[PDB]
Design an enzyme around this catalytic site. Structure first.
Site, PDB file in Angstrom:
ATOM      1  N   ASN A   4      32.215  42.736  36.791  1.00  0.00           N
ATOM      2  CA  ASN A   4      33.023  43.899  37.167  1.00  0.00           C
ATOM      3  C   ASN A   4      34.394  43.837  36.513  1.00  0.00           C
ATOM      4  O   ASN A   4      34.957  44.864  36.113  1.00  0.00           O
ATOM      5  CB  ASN A   4      33.142  44.013  38.686  1.00  0.00           C
ATOM      6  N   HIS A  25      27.115  36.869  44.170  1.00  0.00           N
ATOM      7  CA  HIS A  25      27.317  38.262  43.812  1.00  0.00           C
ATOM      8  C   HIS A  25      26.166  38.755  42.944  1.00  0.00           C
ATOM      9  O   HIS A  25      25.967  38.269  41.828  1.00  0.00           O
ATOM     10  CB  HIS A  25      28.649  38.364  43.075  1.00  0.00           C
ATOM     11  N   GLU A  43      26.330  35.943  40.187  1.00  0.00           N
ATOM     12  CA  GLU A  43      27.582  35.227  39.955  1.00  0.00           C
ATOM     13  C   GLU A  43      27.808  34.345  41.166  1.00  0.00           C
ATOM     14  O   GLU A  43      27.830  34.828  42.298  1.00  0.00           O
ATOM     15  CB  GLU A  43      28.745  36.199  39.763  1.00  0.00           C
ATOM     16  N   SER A  46      32.358  42.757  46.363  1.00  0.00           N
ATOM     17  CA  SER A  46      32.850  43.095  45.033  1.00  0.00           C
ATOM     18  C   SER A  46      34.350  43.388  45.045  1.00  0.00           C
ATOM     19  O   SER A  46      34.982  43.462  43.996  1.00  0.00           O
ATOM     20  CB  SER A  46      32.099  44.310  44.482  1.00  0.00           C
TER      21      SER A  46
END
Lengths: 292, 316
Positions: B222, B172, B184, B151
């Site tokens: 994010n 992800h 993702e 991340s």
């Protein structure tokens, strides 16, 4: 000593004003809805009726007479007028939901200030202006607050109650009580741009647009990502279309004007282009997405 | 001349022979090596196994692995009670079958020579990840795809620790991995379409909805979520509104399942701070990654959120 809001004057029969009127009336408040023309008012009240009727048909299936009574009683407690000054002489609360223009609002409130009873609270539903700016158009700043609702008003349970540094606690508490009387949940915020919701929501929407504009992801993947990754009811592009691209742009424009260096408020070419083409989202049948 | 060539290529490409061939060359991810027995890796291992993939879960010692797998068993037993509320046996079989397809090894290099996909979910340290991947690169089968669940690092930076960048991507996931249906899939400029499609396919095989994003900081979720959480903290720190009211406002005003302070506690205050610190270090002048004194203080006190029983709020 605080006033119990019973009689409410709502100025502006647009989506917000009509929604505020509907909920206030549906919750036992006497309402006077004010706008420029009888045709506008007739249309606003008709929209309220249809919205109440839709609800009633679902909720009162097992008791249709109760349903009809609810709708009729609710509409009955909504009066209309094209003359704000004539209605505020003994109203408890004025809620303004008109065009987002400081000059228009101030002209309105300066006038109402002269005609309203002393106990009358004034509140603005504005999303674009500081309450303080409007409050100072009157001499009743202690009775001036922000009372900020969300579309669709009869559904959205939040109300932001905004004190300026001049608003009395008495006024604040009356509005908290009024909000609860509407079946809503009031929260408090200082008179700062965007209050809570828009302040945290709108810049995020702009960031979603900017991510798309950089070529980083499709609108569709971004919407999916936020729905499935963050549990949002709507993807930001869906939500932009839903709340209005013109509505959004105007708010950000305002924020950009007062703070031009702030990255968060940088205009979006894509957003600007859609608004210039009068593609405003769901309400025009097209924004980032097409509807029909 | 060139127009003719492209024409010949196109007609060949739509031919039964070429389409059958291309289809036949697809390598379906069946064997997965998950590296990192923490919440993310265990969750990834769990879903992969539950959806019929063979998994090796990798971490540093047998004790760590035993405990990770114990966590998976406990999560599966909960799933089983929901899947099969009225049939313990069906639930038992689901749990046992799933668990049995999760092997455990302390050295990933020992198994990657016959794995289709490595998913790395270890400490967010570029040097450590790079050491790992450079070494696995030596042992992994040619077809093996490498993916990172990172991340805070750019996929490209990790990919270049190997010489299989065409077979390197970000993959992800989101906590809790078995529950969150989003993945993702991150291409670097070097990731092949073959690799990308295999991971898209793998993502769907996990019962998830893959989305695509450039190898940019924060990808999609994010990148849009975390700066909003920081803004919420900042609004609170300005004294403009209470945490409780901001949470209520976002739940009722924006329809969010959790207001930003509860969500911060949920996703982890240390987890969050670490990401934003990275963004701040990379883009020091940028206002949006400015550290939060409140957040910093809580993290300094090991108040990491729900996982420690206290973050912005106190739990338990």
């Amino acid at each position: 000593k605080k006033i119990i809001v019973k009689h409410v004057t709502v100025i502006g029969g647009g989506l917000m004003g009509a929604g505020i009127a509907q909920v206030a009336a549906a919750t036992g408040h006497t309402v006077v809805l004010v706008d420029q023309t009888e045709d506008i008012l007739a249309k606003s009240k008709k929209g309220i009726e249809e919205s109440l009727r839709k609800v009633a048909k679902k909720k009162f299936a097992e008791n249709p007479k109760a349903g009809d009574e609810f709708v009729e009683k609710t509409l009955s407690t909504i009066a209309t007028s094209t003359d704000a000054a004539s209605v505020v002489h003994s109203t408890d609360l004025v809620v303004e939901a008109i065009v987002e223009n400081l000059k228009v609002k101030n002209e309105l409130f300066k006038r109402l200030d002269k005609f309203a009873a002393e106990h009358t609270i004034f509140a603005s539903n504005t999303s674009s202006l500081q309450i303080t700016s409007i409050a100072n158009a009157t001499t009743r700043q202690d009775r001036f607050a922000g009372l900020h609702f969300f579309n669709p008003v009869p559904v959205m349970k939040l109300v932001e109650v905004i004190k300026t540094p001049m608003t009395s606690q008495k006024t604040f508490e009356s509005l908290v009580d009024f909000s609860k009387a509407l079946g809503k949940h009031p929260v408090s915020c200082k008179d700062t741009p965007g209050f809570i919701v828009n302040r945290l929501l709108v810049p995020y929407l702009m960031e979603a647009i900017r991510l798309y504009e950089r070529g980083d992801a499709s609108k569709e993947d971004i919407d999916t990502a936020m729905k499935l990754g963050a549990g949002y009811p709507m993807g930001p592009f869906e939500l932009l279309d839903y709340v209005g691209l013109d509505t959004t742009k105007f708010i950000v424009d305002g924020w950009h004007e007062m703070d031009a260096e702030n990255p968060l408020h940088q205009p979006s070419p894509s957003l600007n282009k859609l608004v210039a083409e009068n593609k405003f989202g769901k309400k025009t049948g097209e924004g980032f997405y097409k509807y029909k």
